[PDB]
Amino acid sequence: MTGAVCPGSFDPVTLGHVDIFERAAAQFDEVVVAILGMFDLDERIAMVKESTTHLPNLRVQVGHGLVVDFVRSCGMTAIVKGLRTGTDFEYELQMAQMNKHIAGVDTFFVATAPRYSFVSSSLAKEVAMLGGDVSELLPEPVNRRLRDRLN
Amino acid sequence: MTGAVCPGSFDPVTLGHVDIFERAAAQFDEVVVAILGMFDLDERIAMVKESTTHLPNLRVQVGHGLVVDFVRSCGMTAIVKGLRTGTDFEYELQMAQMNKHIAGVDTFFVATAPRYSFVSSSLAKEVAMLGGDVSELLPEPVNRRLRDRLN
Amino acid sequence: MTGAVCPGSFDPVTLGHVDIFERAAAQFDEVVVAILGMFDLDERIAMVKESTTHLPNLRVQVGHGLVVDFVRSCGMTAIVKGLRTGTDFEYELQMAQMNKHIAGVDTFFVATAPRYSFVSSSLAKEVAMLGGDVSELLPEPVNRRLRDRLN
Amino acid sequence: MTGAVCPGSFDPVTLGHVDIFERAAAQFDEVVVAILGMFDLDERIAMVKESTTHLPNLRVQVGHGLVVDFVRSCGMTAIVKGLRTGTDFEYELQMAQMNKHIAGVDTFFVATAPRYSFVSSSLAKEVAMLGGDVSELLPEPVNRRLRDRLN
Amino acid sequence: MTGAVCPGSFDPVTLGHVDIFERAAAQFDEVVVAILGMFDLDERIAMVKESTTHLPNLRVQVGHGLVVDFVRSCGMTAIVKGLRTGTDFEYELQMAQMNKHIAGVDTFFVATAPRYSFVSSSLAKEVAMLGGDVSELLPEPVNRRLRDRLN
Amino acid sequence: MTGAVCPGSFDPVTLGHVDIFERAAAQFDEVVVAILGMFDLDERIAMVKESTTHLPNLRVQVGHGLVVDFVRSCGMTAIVKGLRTGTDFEYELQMAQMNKHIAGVDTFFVATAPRYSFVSSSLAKEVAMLGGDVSELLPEPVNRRLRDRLN
Ligand SMILES: O=C(O)c1ccccc1C(=O)c1ccc(C(=O)O)c([N+](=O)[O-])c1
Ligand SMILES: O=C(O)c1ccccc1C(=O)c1ccc(C(=O)O)c([N+](=O)[O-])c1
Ligand SMILES: O=C(O)c1ccccc1C(=O)c1ccc(C(=O)O)c([N+](=O)[O-])c1
Ligand SMILES: O=C(O)c1ccccc1C(=O)c1ccc(C(=O)O)c([N+](=O)[O-])c1
Ligand SMILES: O=C(O)c1ccccc1C(=O)c1ccc(C(=O)O)c([N+](=O)[O-])c1
Ligand SMILES: O=C(O)c1ccccc1C(=O)c1ccc(C(=O)O)c([N+](=O)[O-])c1
Numbered sequence: 001m002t003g004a005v006c007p008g009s010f011d012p013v014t015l016g017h018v019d020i021f022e023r024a025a026a027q028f029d030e031v032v033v034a035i036l037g038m039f040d041l042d043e044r045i046a047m048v049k050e051s052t053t054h055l056p057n058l059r060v061q062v063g064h065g066l067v068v069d070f071v072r073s074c075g076m077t078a079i080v081k082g083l084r085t086g087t088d089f090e091y092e093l094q095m096a097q098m099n100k101h102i103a104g105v106d107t108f109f110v111a112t113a114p115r116y117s118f119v120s121s122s123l124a125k126e127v128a129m130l131g132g133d134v135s136e137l138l139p140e141p142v143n144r145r146l147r148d149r150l151n
Numbered sequence: 152m153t154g155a156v157c158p159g160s161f162d163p164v165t166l167g168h169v170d171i172f173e174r175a176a177a178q179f180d181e182v183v184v185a186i187l188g189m190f191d192l193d194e195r196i197a198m199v200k201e202s203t204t205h206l207p208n209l210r211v212q213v214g215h216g217l218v219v220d221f222v223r224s225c226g227m228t229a230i231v232k233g234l235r236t237g238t239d240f241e242y243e244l245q246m247a248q249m250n251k252h253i254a255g256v257d258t259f260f261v262a263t264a265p266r267y268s269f270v271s272s273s274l275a276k277e278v279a280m281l282g283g284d285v286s287e288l289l290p291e292p293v294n295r296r297l298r299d300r301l302n
Numbered sequence: 303m304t305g306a307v308c309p310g311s312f313d314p315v316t317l318g319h320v321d322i323f324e325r326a327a328a329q330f331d332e333v334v335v336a337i338l339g340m341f342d343l344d345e346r347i348a349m350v351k352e353s354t355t356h357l358p359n360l361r362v363q364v365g366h367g368l369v370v371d372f373v374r375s376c377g378m379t380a381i382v383k384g385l386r387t388g389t390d391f392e393y394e395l396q397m398a399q400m401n402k403h404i405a406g407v408d409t410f411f412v413a414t415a416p417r418y419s420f421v422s423s424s425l426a427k428e429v430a431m432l433g434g435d436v437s438e439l440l441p442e443p444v445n446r447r448l449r450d451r452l453n
Numbered sequence: 454m455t456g457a458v459c460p461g462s463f464d465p466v467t468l469g470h471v472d473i474f475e476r477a478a479a480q481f482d483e484v485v486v487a488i489l490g491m492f493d494l495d496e497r498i499a500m501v502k503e504s505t506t507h508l509p510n511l512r513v514q515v516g517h518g519l520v521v522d523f524v525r526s527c528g529m530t531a532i533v534k535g536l537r538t539g540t541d542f543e544y545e546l547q548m549a550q551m552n553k554h555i556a557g558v559d560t561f562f563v564a565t566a567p568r569y570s571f572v573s574s575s576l577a578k579e580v581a582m583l584g585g586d587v588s589e590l591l592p593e594p595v596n597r598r599l600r601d602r603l604n
Numbered sequence: 605m606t607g608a609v610c611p612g613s614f615d616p617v618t619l620g621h622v623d624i625f626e627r628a629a630a631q632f633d634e635v636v637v638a639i640l641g642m643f644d645l646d647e648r649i650a651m652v653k654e655s656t657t658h659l660p661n662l663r664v665q666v667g668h669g670l671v672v673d674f675v676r677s678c679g680m681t682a683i684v685k686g687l688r689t690g691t692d693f694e695y696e697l698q699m700a701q702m703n704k705h706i707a708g709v710d711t712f713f714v715a716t717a718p719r720y721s722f723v724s725s726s727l728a729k730e731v732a733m734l735g736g737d738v739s740e741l742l743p744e745p746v747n748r749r750l751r752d753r754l755n
Numbered sequence: 756m757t758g759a760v761c762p763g764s765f766d767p768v769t770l771g772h773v774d775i776f777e778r779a780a781a782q783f784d785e786v787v788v789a790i791l792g793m794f795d796l797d798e799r800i801a802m803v804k805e806s807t808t809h810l811p812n813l814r815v816q817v818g819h820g821l822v823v824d825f826v827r828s829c830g831m832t833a834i835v836k837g838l839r840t841g842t843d844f845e846y847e848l849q850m851a852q853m854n855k856h857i858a859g860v861d862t863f864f865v866a867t868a869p870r871y872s873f874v875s876s877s878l879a880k881e882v883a884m885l886g887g888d889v890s891e892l893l894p895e896p897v898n899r900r901l902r903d904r905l906n
Contacts, residue, residue, distance in 0.1 A: 108260065278551060385546075403740075
C-alpha cells in the first residue's frame with residue numbers, strides 16, 4: 001500500500017541510480033521509475049528495465065507533466081531521489097517544498113553510496129564522448145548501448 | 152512490515168519534529184521515535200507521547216547506544232530524519248554513510264516544512280531562557296512544561 | 303535621503319519579492335524597483351505597480367545597463383535583495399563584491415520569509431506552464447495575467 | 454528615524470567589524486553597536502569607541518538579553534551584520550527568521566570586504582596567542598591592548 | 605620531475621588565474637597552462653604568455669580532449685586549480701574524483717587570494733561589456749586587448 | 756627541494772589520512788606529517804609511522820605552535836590537507852587565507868577518495884566507543900591499538 005516514484009531523465013541510468021532504486025524497493029511495497037538527450041525514450045526504458053530485473057516490486061513507466069501528478073495518478077505516496085552534495089540538497093529542497101505545497105506529495109531523499117558520489121548521467125556522457133572509460137560507473141546494459149552509440 | 156526510526160534528543164520535541172513524525176507515519180507501517188539537557192528522560196517521552204496521540208502507528212521508546220543497533224533490534228528497516236539546510240545535509244550525510252557502512256541501515260531525509268525551517272530544540276530553548284515567546288513553534292504539551300520550568 | 307534599489311527581472315514578481323519590497327520600504331526613505339521571458343516590459347511594470355500600491359515610498363522603473371549605474375544615477379545609496387539559501391548567497395556575494403569594487407555601491411541582503419523560501423519566478427513559471435496552481439505564491443495582479451496568458 | 458543595531462561580542466573588534474559599522478552608518482540615520490572571553494566589558498567598549506571616532510552617527514552600548522529586545526527598546530528598526538560564507542549565512546539565516554518571528558525585527562546582511570573575508574575575532578585571538586602577527590587585521594586601539602595583554 | 609597542469613578556458617586570463625599560476629610554479633618543477641567565447645585561441649595564448657613572463661618554469665599550451673589525457677601525455681603528475689567558494693569546491697570535487705577514477709590523475713586545489721575572490725573571466729566580461737572598469741582585476745596585456753575589442 | 760607538511764591531530768590516523776599522505780608523497784620531494792584526546796603523543800606517532808612504511812620520502816614529527824612556523828622552520832614549502840565537503844572547504848579556506856597572510860605559506864587541498872568521504876578520526880572514535888566496527892576505515896596498526904584500548 002506504500003509506493004515511491006523515482007523520477008528522472010535517466011539518460012542514461014547509472015549505477016548510482018540503480019543503488020537508489022534498490023534502496024527504495026527495500027522500503028516501499030512498490031517502486032515506479034518514471035522517465036521524464038543522448039538516448040531516445042525506448043532506449044532509456046529498456047536500459048532501466050534491463051538493469052533492474054533483480055527488483056520484482058519495481059516497474060518502469062514513461063512520465064509526462066508534473067511529477068506530483070504522476071505520483072497521485074499512480075496512487076503512489078511519495079517521491080524518492082538520491083542526493084550527493086549540499087548544493088544538490090538546496091535545489092531539490094526548493095522542488096520538494098514546491099511539490100508539497102501544490103499537491104501534498106512528500107519527498108524522501110537518500111544519500112548516494114560513497115563510491116557513486118561523483119557519478120551523474122551528464123558527467124558520464126561528457127567523459128564518454130571524449131574517450132574516457134566510465135564502464136565501472138554504469139550497468140552493463142547501458143555500457144553495451146553506449147559502446148554501440150560511440151562505435 | 153516496513154518501519155522507520157526517528158532518532159533524536161527531543162529536548163524538547165518541536166512542531167518541526169512532529170511534522171517529520173507525521174510524514175514518516177504516512178509512509179511506513181510503523182514509526183518508532185527513539186529518544187537518545189533541559190528536560191529529563193521521562194518529561195521528554197511524555198511530551199512526545201502527548202504530541203503524537205493522533206498517530207496510531209507511532210510508538211515512543213528510550214534508546215541507548217548506536218541508532219543502527221536500535222533499528223536492527225526493533226526489526227525496523229530505516230532511519231528517517233528532517234533536514235533544513237545544505238549544512239545539515241553534509242553532517243547528516245557523513246552519519247548516514249557511516250551507518251550504512253557499519254550496519255547496512257539506510258537513512259531517508261525529509262525536507263522541513265518551510266514554516267518550521269528556523270526551528271530547533273536548541274534555538275527554541277535559548278530564546279525561551281531569554282524571555283522570548285516560542286509557543287507557536289512547539290506543541291502545547293511542551294509549552295505547558297516549558298512555562299512551568301521557567302515559572 | 304536614504305534610498306535602496308531592488309533590481310531583478312520580475313517575470314513575474316512573486317509574493318517573495320513583495321515581502322522584500324515591504325521590508326526595504328520600512329528601512330529606507332525611498333525604494334526603487336528596477337526591472338532589468340514570459341511577460342513583456344509593460345506587463346512586468348504594471349504587475350509590480352499593482353502589487354505595491356500599499357507602499358507610498360516605492361517607485362517602479364525600467365532599468366538598463368549595470369545596476370550600480372542605475373543606483374548612482376538615481377542618487378540612491380544601496381542595493382537590496384532577498385536571499386533564500388547559502389548557494390544564493392555565494393553567487394550574490396560575488397556580484398556584491400564586484401559592484402562594490404567598480405562603483406562603491408553597497409548591497410544589503412534580507413532573508414526570505416520562511417513561507418516564501420521555495421518560491422522563485424522561474425519555478426513558479428515552470429509549474430504554472432505544466433498545470434500546477436501557484437496562485438498562493440503570487441500577487442493577484444500576477445495571478446490575473448497568468449491565468450489569461452495560460453487561457 | 455532609521456536605525457540599525459550591529460550586535461556581537463566584539464572580543465576584540467576587528468577591521469572587518471569596523472567595515473560593517475561604516476557601511477551601516479552610511480545607510481542608517483543612527484547605528485548602535487551592541488556589545489553582548491579575552492577582554493572584559495570596559496576594554497571592549499573602549500576599543501570599539503576608539504576605532505569608530507570617525508563615525509559621528511554611531512554609538513556604542515553594552516547589551517543584555519535578546520538582541521531584538523535591545524532593538525525595540527532603542528526604538529531602532531533593524532539588525533545589521535556581516536557575512537563571509539554560505540555557511541555563515543545558514544546559521545545567521547535561522548537566527549534572523551527566529552528574530553523576525555518573535556519580534557518582527559528585520560535583519561540586513563552585508564558581504565564582508567574581500568580583504569577581511571578570513572578575519573574573525575576568534576581566529577585573530579588564536580593566532581595572536583600562538584605568536585602570529587594579526588596587526589594588519591585589527592584597529593590600532595585593539596593592537597595596542599593586544600600587545601599589552603600578551604606582553 | 606614534478607609537474608602540474610593548470611587547465612581552463614582563460615577567456616580571458618585574470619589576475620586570479622595568474623596568482624594560481626605563480627603559486628603552482630613555486631611548488632612544482634614545471635607548470636603547463638592548458639587552454640581548452642570572446643577571444644580566439646591565439647589571443648588567449650598570447651595573453652597568458654604576456655602575463656607570465658616572470659615565471660620561467662611555466663609554459664602555455666593549447667589543449668584538446670580530456671584534461672587527464674593532456675596531463676598523462678605531458679608526463680605531468682597533477683592538475684592544479686583555484687577555488688573561491690564551497691559551491692566551486694563541490695562541482696570541482698565531482699570532476700576531480702572522476703578524473704582520479706578514470707586516469708589516476710590527482711587534483712590539488714588552492715584557495716583564491718582574498719582580493720581576487722569575486723573575480724572570474726565570465727563576470728569580468730559581462731561587466732566589461734556593460735561599460736564597467738575591471739582593469740584592476742586583469743593583467744595589462746588583457747586590459748590592452750579588452751579595450752581594443754570594446755573600442 | 757619541494758616539501759609539504761600534512762598537519763593534524765591524527766587521534767587516530769585513518770585510511771583517509773593515509774590516502775592524503777600517499778598523494779602528497781607522490782607530488783613532493785618530501786612529506787612531513789606534523790602531529791599537533793584518546794591516544795597520547797607516542798601512540799599517535801607510532802600509528803602514523805606503522806601505517807606509512809611504504810612511503811620512503813615521508814617523515815613523522817610532533818609539532819608545536821602555528822603550523823606555518825613549523826613549515827618555515829622545516830624549510831618546507833606548503834601545507835597539504837584533505838577535504839571532504841563544501842563546509843570543510845569554507846573553514847579550511849579561512850585558515851589557509853590566514854596562514855598565507857601571516858607567513859606567506861600556501862595550502863593545497865586534495866579531495867578525499869570517495870570511499871573514505873565519511874571517515875574522520877572523531878566519528879570513527881565515537882562509533883568505536885559505542886561498539887561499532889570501523890576496522891575497514893583504519894590502518895591495522897590503529898585497529899590493533901584500538902581493540903586493546905577498548906578491551
Ligand atoms: O516535472 C516536474 O515535476 C517539475 C516541477 C517543477 C519544475 C520543473 C519540473 C520538471 O520539468 C521536471 C522534469 C523532470 C524531472 C526528473 O528528474 O525526471 C523533474 N524532477 O524534479 O524530478 C522535474
Ligand atoms: O548514536 C549513534 O548512532 C551515533 C553514531 C555515530 C556518532 C554519534 C552517535 C551518537 O552519539 C548519537 C546520539 C544521538 C543521536 C540522536 O539524534 O538521537 C544521534 N543521531 O545521529 O541521530 C547520534
Ligand atoms: O546588470 C548588472 O549589474 C550586472 C552586473 C554584473 C553581471 C551581470 C549583470 C546583469 O546583467 C544583471 C541583469 C539583471 C539583474 C537583475 O536581477 O535585475 C542583475 N542583478 O544582479 O541584480 C544583473
Ligand atoms: O541574544 C540573542 O538575541 C540570541 C537569540 C537567540 C539565540 C541566541 C542569542 C544569543 O545569546 C546571542 C548572543 C550574542 C549575540 C551577538 O552576536 O552579540 C547574538 N547574535 O545573534 O547576534 C546572539
Ligand atoms: O575536458 C575534461 O577533462 C572534461 C572532463 C569531464 C567533463 C568535462 C570536461 C570538459 O569538457 C572540460 C573542458 C575545459 C576545462 C577547463 O577548465 O579547461 C575542464 N576542466 O574541468 O578543467 C573540463
Ligand atoms: O596551529 C595553527 O596553525 C593554528 C592556526 C590558527 C588557528 C588555530 C590553529 C591551531 O591551533 C591548530 C591546531 C592543530 C591543527 C592540526 O590540524 O594539526 C591545525 N590546523 O589547522 O591544521 C591548527
